[PDB]
Amino acid sequence: EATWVTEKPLTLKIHMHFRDKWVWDENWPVAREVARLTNVKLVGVANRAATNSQEQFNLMMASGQLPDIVGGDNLKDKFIRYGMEGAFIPLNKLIDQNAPNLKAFFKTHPEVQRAITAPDGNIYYLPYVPDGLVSRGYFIRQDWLDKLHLKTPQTVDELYTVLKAFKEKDPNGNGKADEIPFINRDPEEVFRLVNFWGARSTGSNTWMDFYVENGKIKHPFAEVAFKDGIKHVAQWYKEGLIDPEIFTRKARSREQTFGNNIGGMTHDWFASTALFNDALSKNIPGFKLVPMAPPINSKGQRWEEDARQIPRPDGWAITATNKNPVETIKLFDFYFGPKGRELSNFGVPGLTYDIKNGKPVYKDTVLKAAQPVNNQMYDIGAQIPIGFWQDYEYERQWTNDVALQGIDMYIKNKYVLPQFTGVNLTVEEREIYDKYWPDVKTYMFEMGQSWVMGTKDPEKTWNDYQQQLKNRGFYQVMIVMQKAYDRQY
Template sequence: MINKIIPSTAIALALAATSGTSVAAGDDDKYKVTDKPLELSIHMHFRNKYAWDENWPVAKEYEKYTGVRLKGVASKIGTNSQELFNLMLVSGNLPDIVGGNSLKDSFIQYGMEGAFLPLNDLIDNYAPNIKAYFEENPEIKKAITAPDGNIYHLAYFPDGQAARAYYVRQDWLDKLGLEQPETVDELYEVLKAFRDRDPNGNGKQDEVPAFFRHWEEMIRMVTLWDARTTGTDSYHQFYIEDHSKVKHGYVDETYRTGIRNLAKWYKEGLIDKEVFTRGSKAREYLLGNNLGGMTHDWFASTAGYNDSLKETIPGFDWIPMAPPASPSGVRMEENGRTTVKPDGWALTYSNKDPIASIKYMDFIFTEKGRNIANFGVEGVHWNMVDGKPTYTQEVLTDSQPVNSQMWSVGAQIPIGFR
């Protein structure tokens, strides 16, 4: 429970007190939100190991364009983001801004209790880019609106549909004279060939035909037999059938059929025997040692192995493939990007300049700010090529996955951005 509730009149007074904040003139300064430099505090701790760092290259870019510096106050050595959030709340000593992952419910609950400022009027009056985005995407606006009708936080809004895909060793297929599998039966034959025909050429039967960092991705393969496991990008969720029926894949007969077939494949050595124990290093170990043949995983980090392994494994060719068709002819990619993540940031009742704060947040919804939030610093991490932001070769060939590199410089973190 928050130990201080701010009345609506106090919010109004806070807004009135800062109404003199203005935008600097001139094209070079069109993103400035204050006449003079302003420092605001932010508690942002996420994924149990990252904390906002004002020295991030991306944070410095935001400051350069807006004139606002966000000073991180969350512990940089803490290892439990939710615990740090709770301690910050009960202290009653709130910073100007709070952000992090999986905080949507807290933002709404404590926002209605007065800990966070309602953003509706701030967005309407001072955030034209956010306002336009909500006008174009009313369902997204609805998704972050609290039961009392107020918006208390801005979320991370992913684009696109598919987030993960099947990846296969195309070089192994070529060596064995095989085509990418178009059906589940063809996939079965491909995996047997990977197991039996020594595609890595070391004279040993040590290949792991199909492997997964997350065992749920193995279970997801029941879709190859017309089953379902989830309705979101999270595991073990219900799904909506025909836009009206709430169902769960685990209770369907097709799910049992899929599990029986996966058990058969596992017994035959087509699926990694250590799928339940190998964990997050599965790709790194099995691909790095030229042992893994196929997986289902995130696009960005999975594709990166083409660059990181090209010198150590000659001819390494690791590419996505369309989902093989089920016996009924259905090709299903069950995983998809959610349109609204439960991540983002909010303004607290202690915020010293709500107008400057919402303008800062609005900058990240401009094309300039959006590119920084997604790709990092232009000329360092990316360049504009044929009108599209494109990562540099240094980023693409680094030993770390692109997303990990972005997190380390302050990009693609769970703030409010597109």
């Protein structure tokens, strides 16, 4: 082939554990097709039985026996830290000399290059580059609203009334108090409910990210607004308005709850969430899960805190043990060219899509499957958090009119908050970040869960919590973040 990266066939080892559920599979249709076109085959070495992606990275790193490539989600920080320590190689020269598609991408997307550049000026990974503007929105059961003679809730107080009616007034009509008013695939979304009481949960699509307010770097979990907001979330959890299993249910939450007519509301991505209307129309007559404007919060605003993050802190890196870095960067580059981008987005031609009227078009068997197309793509090795360039066209093809109405409502009415795009730490500032932040973040999540579940009272533990943050070096992290912000802006 002319797309061939190397003349002699090459096999590389990739450690890629992602989203706590998936590993790289060389038997994937997409992986097979990429191997054929590039003459480079990636063989997975990650533990498929394991269910903690970050831990698997840690074990691999601690063992000292590195593969050739490491990929996965939420590895940006680890790519940078172990890049500077020499476990991953800088890609700057390799890109410049061997990677025209990446060069042309970075030229036209300077902001992405900046986002993946380490404090030493080196690029240690290639990112998952999403395509699109909005991500998540609120969805509510319109059929339940109508059946209970309720108007769409406009404020937090009105929402409380609605969710209470969902819980107590038997909208599925089976005589049981089985309804769960608010559900979510993502446990972290329970924290986002503090938005209703004028508190942030994250600055970006990255969970528990910092934000900027009036020239000051802040972290959502350290703010007194969070203390007051999480108190309310705890109350709603105690009242059973929030899924008792919100921390545990996870991936198939929508299929379980909406699919069995017990879920009333969620906060999730427009396309896949709205697809549930098509999937459940026969099973649950009248089922209508519609986008809802965010309620007016206690600060008098309608917040959509989440948006697409370009790029994501996801991707892959070349190890120092890799004896074929030139061949590897050319493989990496393939994904940003026309054929590579097509495959990594749409799957395999003849299997999952066809070129029709000069464009990749999903087969009817894919579009009418009543299973979200992104899920379908994962199964065959597409839409995975490698270094690749998402093409929104893939998503447009399975975004229905209900999803479109929601997307357009959110764009036009300006609900989406300005996103935190990070600060440029020096190497010295980064040392403090890498040292303290991971353990602080873990502590924050665990305290957050405790407050929500009612095992700890936020009001009674706040002062000791703050002291613990100090002891764990959180405010040392805040100092370097603010210093970096002051330099950059």
